[PDB]
Design a binder for this molecule. Structure first.
Ligand SMILES: CC[C@H]1O[C@]2(C)[C@H](OC(C)=O)[C@@]1(C)O[C@@H](/C=C/C=C/C=C/c1oc(=O)cc(OC)c1C)[C@@H]2O
Ligand SMILES: Nc1ncnc2c1ncn2[C@@H]1O[C@H](COP(=O)(O)OP(=O)(O)NP(=O)(O)O)[C@@H](O)[C@H]1O
Ligand SMILES: Nc1ncnc2c1ncn2[C@@H]1O[C@H](COP(=O)(O)OP(=O)(O)NP(=O)(O)O)[C@@H](O)[C@H]1O
Ligand SMILES: Nc1ncnc2c1ncn2[C@@H]1O[C@H](COP(=O)(O)OP(=O)(O)O)[C@@H](O)[C@H]1O
Ligand SMILES: [Mg+2]
Ligand SMILES: [Mg+2]
Ligand SMILES: [Mg+2]
Lengths: 466, 492, 467
């Protein structure tokens, strides 16, 4: 079917049709252009017109221009032939390696797996990161989220995790770069090449890459998540595959949504956001999940605007994760890396019946002491430690060393820490933390604990200081 | 003369977007009536305008296009109701989602019915035992009462509700029908996998048998999530109106409000304070009023509600938070501070209340915890006022010594709801000063020991306290004996 | 006249009359309903269409439905035959005891008493409540207001006042529940009866009741206060008696309005309130008043959204009162009931020329020290207590003690406090404080001062506490 461009504003193009009005979600192809310009139908304004969202810049379009109903929604190449390739929101390759030749094509809009399809197995996923493992452990086929204001560590953490987990993973992986830096995509691709996860020679790549960065018009950014998502869904269901899905940054999607929302003509909700915020997050977040058919462990980076966690975007996201790593500027500025907030990060697995009570008890042990420190903090602030009780000063000591032991060098951040990256095994973390708690190290200096792997290394660092 | 599509009982979509259809005929629809779309998709007639009907859609509006035929139903929205639902998981409209077959319903009920008036009810007098000391002792909940669970993310709000539902096996597995309590759990805006987890645990606890779970999750259309609470409510009134007893958890009313806000704004209704419709208070009042205690004239049945609300930065003063706190018969405020501190449940004594008071408590309980609440309040204060041991007397040294001991006793784990008599025993021990010399750190361990002792050896005292429902003179004397002695052996 | 419904959107219904447009305030009845639906005309949109507020549910209404102009604002059965009964916004009995056979009927809408109708007598109305009496005495025929955020004691306080005052009161009483809890009207009704304030067998009924609870549509809520108030004005004027008016909670009248305001097409004023708040409040509050004909003693409970006394509503109401009891969650949070704020509660009669200087000097004395202590609280908090002068550490003492002596076990809250309710006489109050202020108890412990009635119980309790 052929409609005509009626109006154009940013990414919101209104197209009128005479004989066949395309259903909502259908992808239209604008005619008369050097490159593909897909329009996704958003609503029927009545009067035989449809209001759509462009998937690329709209410059050049002209009223009266011809548009064609694709007859379906954005459909993209799915299968193993996407492995090792970089693709667009609309599924075209952007790696200058030819067409992605697949048997099947999938549409980016699907419904979420049903209740009966859900899974409830809960297995811990050890990452080698002390704070995470101890206090807010991730879980196989689970939902993890890294909350972070600007330049706090979200991406570095994803990388480190990709390194520590993705690297030695059996199944496939899907990275989806949403609204982030182009150079990052580039940084990754080439790195992926090097360590061979991407092989440009054979069919041995384990990762499929989807990108719609900081340079795309809103509509694209608003859909790429869906795109990466789809690719992942394929491996899950069609091959009962155990997937890994990394997204940077899912905040961008919502942001993108707010960009076109006014254009769609909606009264804004709080903070200028689109009134459909939650539902949009919803029908999207709900497809990123493990099922009876397959497993999807997904790590998603969540940008926090102005550092405000009460912002509708992040706020609304907590409810979709199984484990959350809230990064803090305050901590990072203190020099603690990863800048994880220990009293603010949580995990549905932090249950004695799952991590064992030994784990459970150190975990809550640690938090309790930090909480305690916390109350003392008002006073230490005006009057310092002097006026403190002998007992109080002891929590403080311990807390300052527990606080220091929570930091750790990542390989990925070697260039900045000036130290060699470390991976600590769970039992090593459970342990090192007991001892600290248990006063086994009240003699060592704080500094000894800073920036180390296992406790054993902390003892040594103490000798070196002394 | 094909006369099937006259504009009085039918209409045609003028436009559709974002789940709002602006239907063209529907000349005889009634405000709030249900209509049907060609696609078998049901909607609801909310705006009746001069030239169009604004229809809210109970599903994916993707299947609707300009021109579609819309049909009246002649019915104001309603849903399946009754005993058939127990043990089943339904959506906001009633349909099963546990793929365990159709519901065998013979009864229906409008989701939107005014709460019974003044005349039809009687003062809340029968307890609704949570199983949680803290709650059952300090902020008692009676049947027909509405008590709010409020706190930031992850402070443990749902757990309070789960433990409660689970604690109800006691009576339900029992003989007495008056003591039985059917439970309803409404998940709103929540995540499918979380709910699926939830229903598992309920099943693993053998609680599903008496529970119905209405689910209106994250990807469910706004209107589903919106309706969900009223839906579940209606299923509860069944029991309420038939001399049976029901308990309904609205988990949580925060996400429903956003759905309401969305639904509402998309209908072009001017946004109000904080972007919500000017009537969000009403949105909740209307609902929670329905939880009620009917007099014997009406079956003496009841509906008890436990709505959940999520604060941000533990700010209870917040507009919504306060909107709901001013409707319910109290609130349970959970703080993450307390939580981390070890105080689990993170109930904040001072800030949580019960507007029913002891009338919802057994004499046994009233006996032990009658003044405890204000005592602890007063404790927390001086505890602060002496974070510097300022020239402190005795009455206050005693005050802090009790305070701490009592605080330890109110602590409690998950999934192990205690029986009323059990609670009385343990509180007893504290309140009476028998523990004033034990080391705080000891307390928890003691309670496990003690409770062990009486349950195993002394179930005669337990059964009497339980039975008489009071603490007689001799029971109070057999108790003294046990605690003091055991305590000693224990303090060897 | 007969109009048709042309649009339905929530509580607001637009009606089109072919001939003769019903004036503003007129009540219209919707034809074809199992229950009586009244629509109050709110505006003349033009084109012979009026915009109205529904006095009840709008479900089931249909475009084109018939509507008759009643030819008059909502009129209710007013008179002595209202006593002991329960009424609707629209004057219908809701107690299931049959019609209300009044000789006359009254429109809920009416002009407020003129300026030359005002009275200026001011005589203390002792309540038995230590705090109020001591520091913010209520006045017979005056306007009293109980301010408090959610769950701080507004209702309970209104409850104990009914007990301590309504109960002996020789004259009528009208309690209007506006937008509050239904459970509550049932508690109260049944209490009026078990205490004979309400008599179901005879005409000894001394209290009429009117209700428009939280389970109602904005429309009803916007009017019950009027109904209530209207019943009360009768007994004031047409009978000339001493009325006692209780409204719980007047805030609800205002929130009711805000709830339909947008549908009426208005730009919001600040805090979301409708732009006519004050005037809306004014034309109402101005009726609630004592005149030369009769005397009203209104006790209105006032909700404070988010605990913010500055909220346009609570804020706008202060000027309508002669006496104010301000309650605070911060106080309640400590276990001090009634949670009145001693430094934020005021009475127009707190005048030496009116209560006397012993009264006065005490009150003021009590307030100075509490203020003096407030100022220090935050400071010794951090800097501790040592550096404080004995002079200054005695006021910390006496203050903390007073803070307690101000609490009191109410007779309506035993279910809450686990203590027998005490009522204290004015002099027992003045004296007790006088003494504390005098240094005459610097030996007893604070705790001895918590939740007790008369000063003697504080002394007795010291001993009991003495182990
Ligand atoms: C406001 C930051 C808070 O976040 C923490 C989690 C603590 O809050 C509580 C509840 O625990 C906190 C008060 O202080 C931080 C402590 C930071 C410590 C920084 C240490 C740095 C440091 O420590 C050393 O020992 C040697 C070092 O350099 C060689 C360096 C840079 C922790 O991350
Ligand atoms: N784990 C770490 N250890 C040491 N330094 C780190 C670490 N993580 C982040 N940094 C420092 O912080 C900078 C920002 O890291 P990065 O992972 O990019 O933050 P981000 O959350 O991705 N920023 P953006 O995405 O712009 O909000 C890094 O380049 C390092 O300088
Ligand atoms: N009494 C308890 N003792 C120990 N752990 C508890 C207690 N009750 C709750 N939990 C745990 O504390 C965490 C919070 O539980 P939960 O009730 O889900 O809080 P919540 O308010 O529902 N969180 P969310 O709804 O995700 O914002 C979970 O790990 C529970 O297992
Ligand atoms: N006078 C009082 N003495 C003791 N506790 C009280 C008193 N008034 C209030 N409380 C506590 O406050 C709760 C709320 O009081 P209530 O009148 O409902 O609040 P509101 O002011 O919100 O109407 C009561 O259920 C009770 O537990
Ligand atoms: Mg980044
Ligand atoms: Mg929850
Ligand atoms: Mg009240």
């Amino acid at each position: 079917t052929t409609g005509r461009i009626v109006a154009v504003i940013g990414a919101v193009v209104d197209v009128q049709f005479d004989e066949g009005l395309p259903p909502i979600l259908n992808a239209l192809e604008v005619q008369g252009r050097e490159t593909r310009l897909v329009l996704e139908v958003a609503q029927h304004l009545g009067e035989s017109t449809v209001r759509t969202i462009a998937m690329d810049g709209t410059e050049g379009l002209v009223r009266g221009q011809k548009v064609l109903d694709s007859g379906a929604p954005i459909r993209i190449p799915v299968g193993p032939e996407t492995l090792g390739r970089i693709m667009n929101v609309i599924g075209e390759p952007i790696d200058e390696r030819g067409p992605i030749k697949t048997k099947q094509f999938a549409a980016i809009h699907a419904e979420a797996p049903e209740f009966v399809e859900m899974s409830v197995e809960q297995e811990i996923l050890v990452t080698g990161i002390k704070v995470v493992d101890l206090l807010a452990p991730y879980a196989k086929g689970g939902k993890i989220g890294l909350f972070g204001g600007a330049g706090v560590g979200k991406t570095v953490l994803i990388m480190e995790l990709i390194n520590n987990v993705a690297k030695a993973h059996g199944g496939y992986s899907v990275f989806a770069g949403v609204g982030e830096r182009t150079r990052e995509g580039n940084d990754l691709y080439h790195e992926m090449i090097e360590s061979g996860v991407i092989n440009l020679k054979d069919a041995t790549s384990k990762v499929a890459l989807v990108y719609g960065q900081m340079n795309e018009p809103p509509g694209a950014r608003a859909r790429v998540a869906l795109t990466g998502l789809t690719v992942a869904e394929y491996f899950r269901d069609q091959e009962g595959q155990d997937v890994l899905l990394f997204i940077d940054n899912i905040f961008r999607f919502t942001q993108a949504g707010s960009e076109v929302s006014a254009l769609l003509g909606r009264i804004p909700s709080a903070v200028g956001y689109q009134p459909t915020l939650a539902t949009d997050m919803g029908t999207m977040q709900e497809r990123i999940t493990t099922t009876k058919k397959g497993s999807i462990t997904s790590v998603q980076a969540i940008y926090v605007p102005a550092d405000d966690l009460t912002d509708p975007a992040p706020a609304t996201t907590f409810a979709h994760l199984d484990a959350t790593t809230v990064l803090s500027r305050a901590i990072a500025e203190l020099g603690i890396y990863p800048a994880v907030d220990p009293l603010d990060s949580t995990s549905r697995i932090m249950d004695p019946n799952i991590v064992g009570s030994e784990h459970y008890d150190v975990a809550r042990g640690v938090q309790k002491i930090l909480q305690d420190y916390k109350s003392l903090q008002d006073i230490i602030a005006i009057l310092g430690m002097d006026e403190l009780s002998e007992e109080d000063k002891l929590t403080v000591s311990r807390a300052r060393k527990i606080q220091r032991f929570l930091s750790q060098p990542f390989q990925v951040a070697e260039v900045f820490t000036g130290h060699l990256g470390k991976l600590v095994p769970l039992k090593e973390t459970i342990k090192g933390f007991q001892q600290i708690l248990a006063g086994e190290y009240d003699h060592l200096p704080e500094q000894a604990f800073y920036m180390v792997g296992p406790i054993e290394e902390a003892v040594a660092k103490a000798d070196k200081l002394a | 003369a094909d006369t099937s599509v006259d504009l009085e009982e039918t209409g045609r979509v003028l436009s559709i977007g974002d789940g709002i259809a602006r239907v063209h005929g529907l000349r005889n629809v009634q405000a709030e009536e249900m209509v049907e779309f060609s696609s078998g998709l049901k909607g609801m007639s909310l705006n009746l305008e001069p030239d169009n009907v604004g229809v809210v859609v109970f599903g994916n509006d993707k299947l609707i296009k300009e021109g579609d035929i819309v049909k009246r139903t002649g019915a104001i929205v309603d849903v399946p109701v009754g005993e058939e639902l127990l043990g089943r998981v339904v959506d906001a409209l009633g349909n099963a989602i546990d793929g365990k077959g159709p519901i065998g319903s013979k009864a229906r009920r409008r989701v939107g019915l005014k709460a019974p008036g003044i005349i039809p009810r009687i003062s809340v007098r029968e307890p609704m035992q949570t199983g949680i000391k803290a709650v059952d002792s300090l902020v008692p909940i009676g049947r027909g009462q509405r008590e709010l669970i409020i706190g930031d993310r992850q402070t443990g709000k749902t757990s309070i509700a789960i433990d409660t539902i689970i604690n109800q096996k006691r009576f339900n597995d029992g003989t007495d029908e008056k003591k039985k309590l059917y439970c309803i759990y409404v998940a709103i805006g929540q995540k499918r996998s979380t709910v699926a987890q939830l229903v598992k645990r309920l099943t693993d606890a053998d609680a599903m048998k008496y529970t119905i779970v209405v689910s209106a999750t994250a990807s469910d259309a706004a209107p589903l999530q919106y309706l969900a609470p009223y839906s579940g409510c209606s299923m509860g009134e069944y029991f309420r109106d038939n001399g049976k007893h029901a308990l309904i958890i609205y988990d949580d009313l925060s996400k429903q409000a956003v759905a309401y806000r969305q639904m509402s704004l998309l209908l072009r209704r001017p946004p109000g304070r904080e972007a919500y419709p000017g009537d969000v208070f009403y949105l909740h009042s209307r609902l929670l009023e329905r939880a009620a205690k009917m007099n014997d004239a009406f079956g003496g049945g009841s509906l008890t509600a436990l709505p959940v609300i999520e604060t941000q930065a533990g700010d209870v003063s917040a507009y919504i938070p306060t909107n709901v706190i001013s409707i319910t018969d109290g609130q349970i405020f959970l703080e993450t501070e307390l939580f981390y501190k070890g105080i689990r449940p993170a109930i904040n004594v001072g800030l949580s209340v019960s507007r029913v008071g002891s009338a919802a408590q057994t004499r046994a309980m009233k006996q032990v915890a009658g003044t405890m609440k204000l005592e602890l309040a007063q404790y927390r204060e001086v505890a602060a006022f002496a974070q510097f041991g300022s020239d402190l007397d005795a009455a206050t040294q005693q005050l802090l010594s009790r305070g701490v001991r009592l605080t330890e006793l109110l602590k409690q784990g998950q999934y192990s709801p205690m029986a009323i008599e059990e609670q009385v025993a343990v509180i007893y021990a504290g309140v009476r000063g028998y523990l004033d010399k034990l080391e705080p750190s000891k307390i928890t361990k003691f309670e496990n020991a003690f409770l062990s002792h009486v349950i195993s050896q002394h179930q005669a005292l337990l059964g009497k306290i339980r039975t008489d429902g009071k603490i007689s003179e001799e029971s109070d004397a057999k108790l003294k004996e046990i605690v003091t002695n055991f305590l000693a052996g224990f303090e060897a």
